[PDB]
């Protein structure tokens, strides 16, 4: 049986909160992808979406500085005229290839 | 009367009866064509009985199925099992068994469960745990 | 106008109540079970006992008593309920009969070993094929314990 003092002391010690973290939590690059397009972007898309063996929403956001929505709307625009063919048009994963 | 047979296929808890009779070569799944087997991935999985033997063996016959119970995956295996067994039953009781020998060997050589139901059955749940084998958790101290 | 489920379980508790009552009533008369038989216009009860003339009583005074008790407490109209008492065959081949005799012998001061071997001998003589009697509790001491008396051979599983 603990003394009517030791427990109190323990409680006081315990109220040293702040929460043990056992973690590191290193920061990242904090990307700032473009959200609305412009002329100097637009022509960049037009001039270099060819010479790509594969384009996708991810492919046009990891290399280019545009966002996901910009990517999907671009792929929808580009294929309408016809530069890249569709071969699998499932949602959540678009697969398109250069016409040749 | 007209030549006709009827069989069934089964899975975990799904059953699929199959009416087969001489016709003009139509395949129906509860009032619809085979081409609307909702899962967009098992489409070939239910195409398998047709494609293994070739479509020509269907020009003269009609197959219609009714499937209930189970889940989508189990359901599909029910339709395919029903079609396969109805096919062999028809060849058994109207055509000679010469064709049977090749069609049966080709089926079994490609997959067993076309003609033989899967024997795996669910195991009852037991107290002291959330499953048939698992236990909750022991804490000694 | 009751669902068959509750009707059957009602029959279960029906048999239960009578069985428990009788074991609390006809102990000295060698009660050895009861059977219930339902017929149109009558539900019928059969008692299995040894001292049947005692179960009946003088001019059937006791049996009529029991008929009334079960009537009034079960809400039956006259003539719908009847009790017969019948002598049990092979009185030695009845555990409920034996246990009661063991009880009475102990209450009359008979010794443990003599009583138990009296019973196991009686049942063996009565054409049984295996018997065992177990007594537990305070036996001429403060620390409790049990003793087993057995003859022939039995099964357990």
């Amino acid at each position: 049986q603990l003394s009517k003092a030791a427990k109190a002391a323990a409680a006081l010690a315990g109220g040293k909160k702040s929460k043990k973290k056992w973690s590191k939590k290193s920061m990242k690059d904090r990307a700032q992808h473009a959200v609305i397009l412009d002329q100097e972007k637009y022509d960049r898309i037009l001039k270099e979406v060819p010479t790509y063996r594969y384009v996708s929403v991810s492919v046009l956001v990891d290399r280019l500085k545009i966002g996901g929505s910009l990517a999907r709307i671009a792929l929808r625009h580009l294929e309408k005229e016809g530069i890249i063919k569709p071969i699998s048009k499932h949602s959540k994963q678009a697969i398109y290839t250069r016409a040749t | 009367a007209v030549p006709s047979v009827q069989t069934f296929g089964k899975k975990k808890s799904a059953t699929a009866v199959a009416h087969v009779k001489a016709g003009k070569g139509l395949i129906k799944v509860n009032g619809s064509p085979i081409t609307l087997v909702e899962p967009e991935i098992l489409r070939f999985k239910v195409y398998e009985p047709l494609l293994l033997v070739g479509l020509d063996k269907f020009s003269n016959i009609d197959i219609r199925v009714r499937v209930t119970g189970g889940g989508h995956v189990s359901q599909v295996y029910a339709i395919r099992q029903a079609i396969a067994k109805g096919l062999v039953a028809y060849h058994q009781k109207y055509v000679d068994e010469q064709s049977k020998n090749e069609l049966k060997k080709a089926f079994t050589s490609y997959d067993r469960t076309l003609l033989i139901a899967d024997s795996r059955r669910p195991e009852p749940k037991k107290f002291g745990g959330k499953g048939a084998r698992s236990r909750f958790q022991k804490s000694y101290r | 106008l009751i669902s068959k489920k509750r009707k059957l379980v009602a029959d279960g508790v029906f048999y239960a109540e009578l069985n428990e009552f009788f074991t609390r009533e006809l102990a000295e008369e060698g009660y050895s079970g009861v059977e219930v038989r339902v017929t149109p216009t009558k539900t019928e009860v059969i008692i299995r006992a040894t001292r049947t003339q005692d179960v009946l009583g003088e001019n059937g005074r006791r049996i009529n008593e029991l008929t009334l008790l079960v009537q009034k407490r079960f809400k039956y109209a006259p003539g719908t309920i009847v009790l017969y008492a019948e002598r049990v065959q092979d009185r030695g081949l009845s555990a409920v009969a034996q246990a009661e005799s063991m009880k009475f012998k102990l209450l009359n001061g008979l010794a443990i070993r003599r009583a138990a071997y009296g019973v196991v001998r009686y049942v063996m003589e009565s054409g049984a094929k295996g018997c065992e009697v177990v007594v537990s509790g305070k036996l001429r001491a403060a620390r409790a314990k049990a003793m087993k008396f057995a003859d022939g051979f039995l099964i357990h599983s």
């Binding site: - | 009032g31 619809s32 609307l36 909702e38 | -």
Partner: protein, 143 residues
């Protein structure tokens, strides 16, 4: 060669019939539209908000063409979903009723469905004229 609703893909038929109902725009609108959730189980109103009543009518229409009789109870059971009860585990909740009720009344006023004996709604004579002809047009669209 003859066709029916069951001869066309489920998604396409609904999209076709809803687009059909668009340009006449004479089905109905409850008025409290683009304010409600369609169910207590949902978390956000429909993203479309430019309709989705025509979609609802199309789906319930073919659903009745599928079954024999349907009521609001079955519509709620069908269209409900798994509600996220915050921290407690999820649970099934049937969808809103007033929505499907007004949908059924709208189809009544258009004459696609009617009250049926022994409860529920049945598809109408001229109703199936519409559903089959829409299905036919949808299928021959592939040419």
């Amino acid at each position: 060669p003859g066709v029916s609703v069951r001869d066309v893909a489920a998604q396409d038929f609904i999209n076709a019939y809803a687009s059909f109902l668009q340009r006449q725009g004479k089905l109905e609108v409850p008025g409290y539209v683009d304010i409600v959730k369609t169910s207590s189980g949902n978390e956000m109103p429909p993203q479309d908000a430019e309709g989705w009543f025509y979609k609802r009518a199309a789906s319930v229409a073919r659903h009745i063409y599928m079954r024999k009789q349907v009521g609001v109870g079955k519509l709620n059971k069908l269209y409900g979903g798994a509600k996220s009860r915050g921290v407690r585990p999820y649970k099934h909740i049937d969808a809103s009723g007033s929505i499907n009720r007004k949908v059924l009344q709208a189809l009544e006023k258009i004459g696609i469905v009617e009250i049926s004996p022994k409860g529920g709604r049945r598809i109408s004579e001229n109703g199936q004229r519409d559903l089959d002809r829409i299905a036919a047009q949808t299928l021959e669209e592939d040419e």
